[PDB]
Design an enzyme around this catalytic site. Structure first.
Site, PDB file in Angstrom:
ATOM      1  N   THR A 213       0.817  -1.229   0.000  1.00  0.00           N
ATOM      2  CA  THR A 213       0.000   0.000   0.000  1.00  0.00           C
ATOM      3  C   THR A 213       0.852   1.280   0.000  1.00  0.00           C
ATOM      4  O   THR A 213       0.298   2.398   0.023  1.00  0.00           O
ATOM      5  CB  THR A 213      -0.925   0.048   1.211  1.00  0.00           C
ATOM      6  OG1 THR A 213      -0.149  -0.177   2.396  1.00  0.00           O
ATOM      7  CG2 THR A 213      -2.063  -1.004   1.082  1.00  0.00           C
TER       8      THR A 213
ATOM      9  N   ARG B 168      -2.059  -2.886   7.618  1.00  0.00           N
ATOM     10  CA  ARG B 168      -3.464  -2.409   7.642  1.00  0.00           C
ATOM     11  C   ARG B 168      -4.291  -3.164   6.607  1.00  0.00           C
ATOM     12  O   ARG B 168      -3.744  -3.729   5.663  1.00  0.00           O
ATOM     13  CB  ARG B 168      -3.568  -0.891   7.384  1.00  0.00           C
ATOM     14  CG  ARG B 168      -3.360  -0.008   8.624  1.00  0.00           C
ATOM     15  CD  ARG B 168      -3.126   1.470   8.252  1.00  0.00           C
ATOM     16  NE  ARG B 168      -1.825   1.697   7.611  1.00  0.00           N
ATOM     17  CZ  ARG B 168      -1.339   2.893   7.279  1.00  0.00           C
ATOM     18  NH1 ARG B 168      -2.016   4.000   7.533  1.00  0.00           N
ATOM     19  NH2 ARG B 168      -0.150   2.992   6.705  1.00  0.00           N
TER      20      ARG B 168
ATOM     21  N   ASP C 234       2.542  -8.343   9.810  1.00  0.00           N
ATOM     22  CA  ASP C 234       3.568  -7.472  10.384  1.00  0.00           C
ATOM     23  C   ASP C 234       4.918  -8.179  10.270  1.00  0.00           C
ATOM     24  O   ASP C 234       5.162  -9.171  10.953  1.00  0.00           O
ATOM     25  CB  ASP C 234       3.272  -7.134  11.851  1.00  0.00           C
ATOM     26  CG  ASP C 234       4.175  -6.022  12.385  1.00  0.00           C
ATOM     27  OD1 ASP C 234       5.315  -5.858  11.877  1.00  0.00           O
ATOM     28  OD2 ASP C 234       3.746  -5.293  13.296  1.00  0.00           O
TER      29      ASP C 234
ATOM     30  N   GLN D 185      14.827  -1.570  -2.116  1.00  0.00           N
ATOM     31  CA  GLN D 185      14.756  -0.109  -2.278  1.00  0.00           C
ATOM     32  C   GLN D 185      15.311   0.613  -1.061  1.00  0.00           C
ATOM     33  O   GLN D 185      14.801   0.455   0.044  1.00  0.00           O
ATOM     34  CB  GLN D 185      13.325   0.356  -2.484  1.00  0.00           C
ATOM     35  CG  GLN D 185      13.147   1.874  -2.492  1.00  0.00           C
ATOM     36  CD  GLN D 185      11.797   2.259  -3.063  1.00  0.00           C
ATOM     37  OE1 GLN D 185      11.422   1.765  -4.128  1.00  0.00           O
ATOM     38  NE2 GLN D 185      11.036   3.110  -2.340  1.00  0.00           N
TER      39      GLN D 185
ATOM     40  N   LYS E 103      19.867   9.010   0.636  1.00  0.00           N
ATOM     41  CA  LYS E 103      20.532   9.172   1.937  1.00  0.00           C
ATOM     42  C   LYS E 103      21.747   8.249   2.082  1.00  0.00           C
ATOM     43  O   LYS E 103      22.586   8.443   2.969  1.00  0.00           O
ATOM     44  CB  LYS E 103      19.548   8.956   3.097  1.00  0.00           C
ATOM     45  CG  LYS E 103      18.709  10.199   3.441  1.00  0.00           C
ATOM     46  CD  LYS E 103      17.869  10.000   4.713  1.00  0.00           C
ATOM     47  CE  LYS E 103      16.690   9.036   4.473  1.00  0.00           C
ATOM     48  NZ  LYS E 103      16.215   8.416   5.749  1.00  0.00           N
TER      49      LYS E 103
ATOM     50  N   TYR F  17      20.362   1.797   5.716  1.00  0.00           N
ATOM     51  CA  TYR F  17      20.559   1.365   4.324  1.00  0.00           C
ATOM     52  C   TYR F  17      21.787   0.444   4.172  1.00  0.00           C
ATOM     53  O   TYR F  17      21.700  -0.607   3.536  1.00  0.00           O
ATOM     54  CB  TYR F  17      20.749   2.577   3.407  1.00  0.00           C
ATOM     55  CG  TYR F  17      19.548   3.455   3.133  1.00  0.00           C
ATOM     56  CD1 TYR F  17      18.251   3.080   3.485  1.00  0.00           C
ATOM     57  CD2 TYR F  17      19.713   4.651   2.430  1.00  0.00           C
ATOM     58  CE1 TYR F  17      17.149   3.904   3.188  1.00  0.00           C
ATOM     59  CE2 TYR F  17      18.621   5.479   2.121  1.00  0.00           C
ATOM     60  CZ  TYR F  17      17.342   5.105   2.508  1.00  0.00           C
ATOM     61  OH  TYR F  17      16.274   5.920   2.181  1.00  0.00           O
TER      62      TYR F  17
ATOM     63  N   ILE G  39      10.296  11.087  -3.921  1.00  0.00           N
ATOM     64  CA  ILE G  39       9.334  10.386  -4.778  1.00  0.00           C
ATOM     65  C   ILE G  39       8.071  11.207  -5.045  1.00  0.00           C
ATOM     66  O   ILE G  39       7.435  11.725  -4.130  1.00  0.00           O
ATOM     67  CB  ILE G  39       8.985   8.981  -4.225  1.00  0.00           C
ATOM     68  CG1 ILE G  39      10.265   8.154  -4.026  1.00  0.00           C
ATOM     69  CG2 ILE G  39       8.060   8.222  -5.168  1.00  0.00           C
ATOM     70  CD1 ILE G  39      10.023   6.805  -3.360  1.00  0.00           C
TER      71      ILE G  39
HETATM   72  N1  LIG Z   1       8.835   8.194  -0.125  1.00  0.00           N
HETATM   73  C1  LIG Z   1       9.890   8.915  -0.542  1.00  0.00           C
HETATM   74  O1  LIG Z   1       9.765  10.221  -1.058  1.00  0.00           O
HETATM   75  C2  LIG Z   1      11.261   8.296  -0.462  1.00  0.00           C
HETATM   76  C3  LIG Z   1      12.320   8.891  -1.144  1.00  0.00           C
HETATM   77  C4  LIG Z   1      13.543   8.231  -1.226  1.00  0.00           C
HETATM   78  C5  LIG Z   1      13.695   6.990  -0.636  1.00  0.00           C
HETATM   79  N2  LIG Z   1      12.649   6.390   0.015  1.00  0.00           N
HETATM   80  C6  LIG Z   1      12.903   5.076   0.657  1.00  0.00           C
HETATM   81  O2  LIG Z   1      12.061   4.009   0.264  1.00  0.00           O
HETATM   82  C7  LIG Z   1      11.974   3.104   1.375  1.00  0.00           C
HETATM   83  C8  LIG Z   1      10.578   3.029   1.977  1.00  0.00           C
HETATM   84  O3  LIG Z   1       9.661   2.971   0.968  1.00  0.00           O
HETATM   85  P1  LIG Z   1       8.450   4.007   0.788  1.00  0.00           P
HETATM   86  O4  LIG Z   1       8.699   5.433   1.048  1.00  0.00           O
HETATM   87  O5  LIG Z   1       7.984   3.522  -0.557  1.00  0.00           O
HETATM   88  O6  LIG Z   1       7.388   3.488   1.934  1.00  0.00           O
HETATM   89  P2  LIG Z   1       5.816   3.910   2.271  1.00  0.00           P
HETATM   90  O7  LIG Z   1       5.254   4.683   1.150  1.00  0.00           O
HETATM   91  O8  LIG Z   1       5.869   4.629   3.555  1.00  0.00           O
HETATM   92  O9  LIG Z   1       5.099   2.497   2.380  1.00  0.00           O
HETATM   93  C9  LIG Z   1       5.456   1.597   3.398  1.00  0.00           C
HETATM   94  C10 LIG Z   1       4.648   0.333   3.162  1.00  0.00           C
HETATM   95  O10 LIG Z   1       5.095  -0.723   3.990  1.00  0.00           O
HETATM   96  C11 LIG Z   1       4.022  -1.139   4.833  1.00  0.00           C
HETATM   97  N3  LIG Z   1       4.582  -1.482   6.149  1.00  0.00           N
HETATM   98  C12 LIG Z   1       5.191  -0.650   7.075  1.00  0.00           C
HETATM   99  N4  LIG Z   1       5.594  -1.421   8.118  1.00  0.00           N
HETATM  100  C13 LIG Z   1       5.244  -2.709   7.853  1.00  0.00           C
HETATM  101  C14 LIG Z   1       5.390  -3.891   8.567  1.00  0.00           C
HETATM  102  N5  LIG Z   1       5.961  -3.867   9.762  1.00  0.00           N
HETATM  103  N6  LIG Z   1       4.927  -5.076   8.030  1.00  0.00           N
HETATM  104  C15 LIG Z   1       4.310  -5.099   6.785  1.00  0.00           C
HETATM  105  N7  LIG Z   1       4.170  -3.910   6.077  1.00  0.00           N
HETATM  106  C16 LIG Z   1       4.625  -2.755   6.611  1.00  0.00           C
HETATM  107  C17 LIG Z   1       2.996   0.003   4.871  1.00  0.00           C
HETATM  108  O11 LIG Z   1       1.654  -0.409   5.118  1.00  0.00           O
HETATM  109  P3  LIG Z   1       1.102  -0.594   6.636  1.00  0.00           P
HETATM  110  O12 LIG Z   1       1.460   0.631   7.425  1.00  0.00           O
HETATM  111  O13 LIG Z   1      -0.393  -0.804   6.577  1.00  0.00           O
HETATM  112  O14 LIG Z   1       1.703  -1.849   7.216  1.00  0.00           O
HETATM  113  C18 LIG Z   1       3.156   0.532   3.471  1.00  0.00           C
HETATM  114  O15 LIG Z   1       2.386  -0.282   2.611  1.00  0.00           O
HETATM  115  C19 LIG Z   1      12.790   3.667   2.521  1.00  0.00           C
HETATM  116  O16 LIG Z   1      14.059   3.088   2.565  1.00  0.00           O
HETATM  117  C20 LIG Z   1      12.764   5.133   2.183  1.00  0.00           C
HETATM  118  O17 LIG Z   1      13.763   5.812   2.897  1.00  0.00           O
HETATM  119  C21 LIG Z   1      11.434   7.031   0.119  1.00  0.00           C
HETATM  120 CL   LIG Z   2      16.636   8.408   0.931  1.00  0.00          CL
END
Ligand SMILES: NC(=O)c1ccc[n+]([C@@H]2O[C@H](COP(=O)([O-])OP(=O)(O)OC[C@H]3O[C@@H](n4cnc5c(N)ncnc54)[C@H](OP(=O)(O)O)[C@@H]3O)[C@@H](O)[C@H]2O)c1
Ligand SMILES: [Cl-]
Ligand code: NA
EC number: 1.3.1.3
Length: 364
Positions: A10, A39, A56, A118, A122, A154, A181
């Site tokens: 999600t 969720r 989880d 991913q 940073k 990371y 992103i």
């Molecule tokens: N978003 C950005 O602008 C950005 C930019 C550069 C790098 N990144 C990197 O990309 C990576 C994270 O990805 P993102 O930003 O794509 O994440 P995100 O949009 O915050 O999504 C996180 C996903 O993982 C699920 N999740 C969280 N904890 C969980 C658990 N314990 N068990 C199962 N599912 C879980 C969440 O759903 P639920 O909460 O329902 O479990 C959600 O579906 C990180 O390393 C981040 O630093 C992000």
């Molecule tokens: Cl980052």
């Protein structure tokens, strides 16, 4: 025969992967897809439903229970993280989660081929806690740069993956490092477009100008970004291309922009007066949006919106971290040299993600 496990389905990338993987002409296809999140899945229509798995991954019992049975998985897409107040804590919590996924999957998937991890930019800048306190690398950032001498979850995740890939001969890996992103997901912990949309909606509701909450280097300097769909395509490319295997790669749109101009775009999409850069006065989303919970709820009620709480869609700290700092560019040379020629027009993409936020009724 290709079978994907999207971990964080999600999320801002999980969602793009979920839409794209099952398409008829997707490389590596036809794909079977499993999607993991904690969720319950939101009640919106899917053109191509996925097999949703509630788990989880921070709990070893639950990950073992939920993921062990998924014995046909060929590709793992790890697109989640745990957000904690200190980087030591981040290493702690993030390492367990990832190790939990691999421990459940590797022994039980005889056809497991690839782990796509991913991370992000940073890698080169150091952890959120280090910002402005620490010497970082000279941009544009290239993948041959050495690791900084400061802890980073990371780095810890990379090392775990390299260790764990030796459990199984044949098993390959890739790393994906985006910058900020531009995407869609009201479930995301870091969602700039979503955040900016909510801010703009509130300004429109209140009859206020869309004032610019950021610094001059963001307003007038060059920035880039990383499209959620492009990032998904990048994951998929690594999954299928021999020249992508066992390599870390940056992912960004292949263009640059200035917030000076993107802010005007934002304003136009919401029919709101555009603020200009305000010298010698410093402006944060966190401050301006303090106490706006009831105003947001009024907006949701008046416009029959998806019922969100302000804290789940207005990620003000994240928007301030981006807009309040200079953007340091990365390089796509290595991706291109290894065969990934995907790109996005960032302005067009920005409008598209704003439109998606409106189509799913997150904002009016
Ligand atoms: N978003 C950005 O602008 C950005 C930019 C550069 C790098 N990144 C990197 O990309 C990576 C994270 O990805 P993102 O930003 O794509 O994440 P995100 O949009 O915050 O999504 C996180 C996903 O993982 C699920 N999740 C969280 N904890 C969980 C658990 N314990 N068990 C199962 N599912 C879980 C969440 O759903 P639920 O909460 O329902 O479990 C959600 O579906 C990180 O390393 C981040 O630093 C992000
Ligand atoms: Cl980052
Ligand atoms: Na796009």
């Amino acid at each position: 025969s290709s079978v994907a496990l999207i971990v964080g389905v999600t999320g801002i990338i999980g969602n793009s992967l979920a839409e794209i993987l099952p398409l008829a002409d997707t490389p590596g296809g036809p794909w079977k897809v499993y999607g993991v999140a904690r969720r319950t899945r939101p009640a919106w229509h899917e053109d191509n439903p996925i097999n949703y798995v509630q788990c989880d991954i921070s709990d070893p019992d639950d990950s073992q229970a939920k993921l062990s049975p998924l014995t046909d998985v060929t590709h793992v897409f790890y697109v989640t993280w745990a957000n904690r107040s200190t980087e030591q804590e981040n290493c702690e919590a993030n390492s367990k989660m990832f190790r939990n996924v691999l421990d459940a999957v590797i022994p039980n998937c005889p056809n497991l081929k690839h782990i796509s991890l991913q991370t992000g930019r940073k890698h080169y800048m150091g952890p959120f806690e280090s910002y402005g306190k620490i010497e970082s690398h000279d941009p544009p950032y290239t993948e041959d740069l050495p690791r900084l001498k400061y802890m980073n979850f990371y780095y810890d995740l990379e090392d775990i993956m390299l260790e764990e890939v030796e459990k199984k001969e044949g098993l390959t890996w890739s790393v994906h490092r985006p910058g900020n992103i531009f995407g869609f997901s009201p479930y995301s912990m870091m969602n700039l477009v979503g955040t900016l949309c909510v801010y703009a909606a509130i300004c429109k509701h209140e009859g206020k100008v869309l004032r610019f909450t950021g610094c001059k280097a963001a307003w007038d300097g060059y920035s880039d970004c990383s499209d959620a769909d492009l990032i998904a395509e990048h994951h998929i490319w690594a999954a299928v291309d021999p020249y992508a295997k066992n390599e870390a790669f940056n992912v960004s749109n292949g263009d640059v922009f200035k917030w000076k101009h993107f802010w005007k775009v934002l304003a136009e999409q919401f029919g709101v007066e555009c603020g200009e850069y305000e010298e010698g006065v410093d402006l944060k989303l966190q401050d301006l949006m303090k106490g706006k919970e009831p105003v947001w709820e009024e907006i949701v009620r008046e416009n029959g919106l998806t019922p969100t709480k302000l804290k789940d869609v207005g990620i003000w700290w994240f928007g301030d971290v981006i807009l309040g700092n200079e953007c340091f560019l990365d390089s796509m040379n290595k991706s291109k040299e290894h065969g990934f020629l995907g790109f996005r027009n960032s302005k067009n993409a920005f409008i598209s993600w704003i439109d998606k936020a409106k189509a799913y009724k997150i904002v009016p």
